[PDB]
Chains A and B, each alone.
With several copies, the nearest count.
Chain A
Amino acid sequence: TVTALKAGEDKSIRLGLFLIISGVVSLFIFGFCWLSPALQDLQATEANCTVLSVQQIGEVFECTFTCGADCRGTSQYPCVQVYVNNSESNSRALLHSDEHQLLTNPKCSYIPPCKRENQKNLESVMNWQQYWKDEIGSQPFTCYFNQHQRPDDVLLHRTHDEIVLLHCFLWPLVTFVVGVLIVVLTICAKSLAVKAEAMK
C-alpha cells in the first residue's frame, strides 16, 4: 500500500543517514585537526631528569597583566634560565616547564603569573628560582624531551591533556552509532508494521 506513517518514517531515515554521514565527516575533520598536535606530543620521549645549573641573564623581558575588562599593563620580570640532564642527550639542555612558556619566551625557563607590580613578579621569580636552585643533585624529575626537533629544550608537562583529545573522538563515534540505531529501528518499524497489518 502506502500508509499515513510513511512521511515521518522516511524523514527518520534521512535523519539517521545525516547522522551517519556527520559522524564519519566529523571523524575525518577531527582526524586532520588533531594529526599534527597528537604526533608532536606523542613523539616526545619520557625521561628521568636532574638539575645541573641555574642563573639569571642580567636582563629583563616584559609580560602583560590584565585587570579584567580591557587592560595591557606591560611589566618587566627577571629572566631565569635552568639547565637539566636527560637520558637521551646526557648533555646540557634548557628547561622550560610547560609548552606554552617555550612558545612565548624560550630564552627563560619560567614566566611568572603577570601582575600590576614589578616587585610581585620579581619576588615570584625569586620564590620559584630558590626551588630549582637547591634541586641540584636531588632525586630525578620525570620530564619530556624531543630529540627529533628540540634537542636543547626540556618540558615538565604535556602539550595537551588526553581528556579533550578523547572527547573529540568519542562524540563522532556516538553520533554515528545513534544514526545507525535510528536507521535500524525505522526500517524495523516499516518492515514489521506490514507483517502486523497482513496478520490483523
Chain B
Amino acid sequence: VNLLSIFISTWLTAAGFIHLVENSGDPWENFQNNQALTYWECVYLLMVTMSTVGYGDVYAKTTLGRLFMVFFILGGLAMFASYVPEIIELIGNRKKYGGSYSAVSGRKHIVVCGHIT
C-alpha cells in the first residue's frame, strides 16, 4: 500500500504539473507556444516516459515543459524501475499446495511425510 500510494500519487501529480505548464506556454514566448493536451494525455505521456518506451506520438513542446521532463526523467525512471518489480513481487505469490484432502467413500488413503525428496 505504501508503494502503490507513492507511485500513483507521484504519477498523477506530475501529470497535473505538465498539464498546467503545456496548456499555458513559456512567458517569454508571450504564452504563444502552448499545446492543447488533455489531463489524460499527460497521464499517458508520463507512463510512456517512466517506462522508457517514449513513443514520441505526444511529448512536451514548451521550454518549461521540456525543463520539467528532464527532472522527471531523472527522478521518475528510478521510481518506476524500483517500484514496479517490487509491487509485482508483493502480489500473486499464491500458495499452490494449500487446501485440503477430500476423502471418498469406499476408498482409503495413507499419509506420507518426513524426508520427501
User: Which residues of B, 46-99, contact A by the 8 Å Cβ criterion?
Assistant: 63, 67, 98-99
B2 on the interface (CB 8 Å rule)? no
Instruction: Report the nearest A residue to B102, measured CB to CB.
Output: A4
A39: shortest Cβ distance to chain B, in Å?
Answer: 12
Given the known interface contacts A7-B98, A7-B99, the answer about A30 and B28 at a Cβ–Cβ threshold of 8 Å is yes
From the candidates B27, B29, B63, B101, name the one contacting A167 in the complex (CB within 8 A). B27
A47 on the interface (CB 8 Å rule)? no
Residues of B within 8 A of A127 (CB): none
- The total of interchain contacts (Cβ-Cβ below 8 angstroms) comes to 33
The segment from A105-113, A158-166, A178-186, A189-197 found at the interface with B is A158-166
Q: Is the CB of B28 within 8 A of A164?
A: yes
B30 on the interface (CB 8 Å rule)? yes
From the candidates B28, B31, B101, name the one contacting A37 in the complex (CB within 8 A). B28
From the candidates B29, B30, B67, B100, name the one contacting A161 in the complex (CB within 8 A). B30
Residues of A within 8 A of B31 (CB): 164
Residues of A within 8 A of B98 (CB): 7
Q: Is the CB of A168 within 8 A of B29?
A: no
The size of the chain B interface, using a CB distance under 8 A, is 14
Q: Is the CB of B100 within 8 A of A168?
A: no
A6 on the interface (CB 8 Å rule)? yes
A29 on the interface (CB 8 Å rule)? yes
Given the known interface contacts A29-B67, A33-B63, the answer about A2 and B100 at a Cβ–Cβ threshold of 8 Å is yes
Residues of B within 8 A of A34 (CB): 28
Q: Is the CB of B102 within 8 A of A168?
A: no
Q: Is the CB of A33 within 8 A of B101?
A: no
Residues of B within 8 A of A164 (CB): 27-28, 30-31
Q: Is the CB of A3 within 8 A of B28?
A: no
B33: shortest Cβ distance to chain A, in Å?
Answer: 11
Residues of B within 8 A of A167 (CB): 27
Q: Is the CB of A3 within 8 A of B27?
A: no
Q: Is the CB of B30 within 8 A of A4?
A: no
Please list the residues of chain B having a beta carbon within 8 angstroms of any beta carbon in chain A.
26-31, 40, 63, 67, 98-102
Sample of 10 A–B contacts (CB below 8 Å):
A6-B100, A7-B98, A7-B99, A7-B100, A30-B28, A32-B40, A161-B30, A164-B27, A164-B28, A164-B31
Q: Which 3 A-B pairs have the closest CB atoms?
A: A7-B99, A4-B102, A34-B28
Known: A6-B99, A33-B63, A164-B31. 11 other contacts (CB 8 A): A7-B98, A7-B99, A7-B100, A32-B40, A33-B26, A34-B28, A37-B29, A164-B28, A164-B30, A168-B27, A168-B28
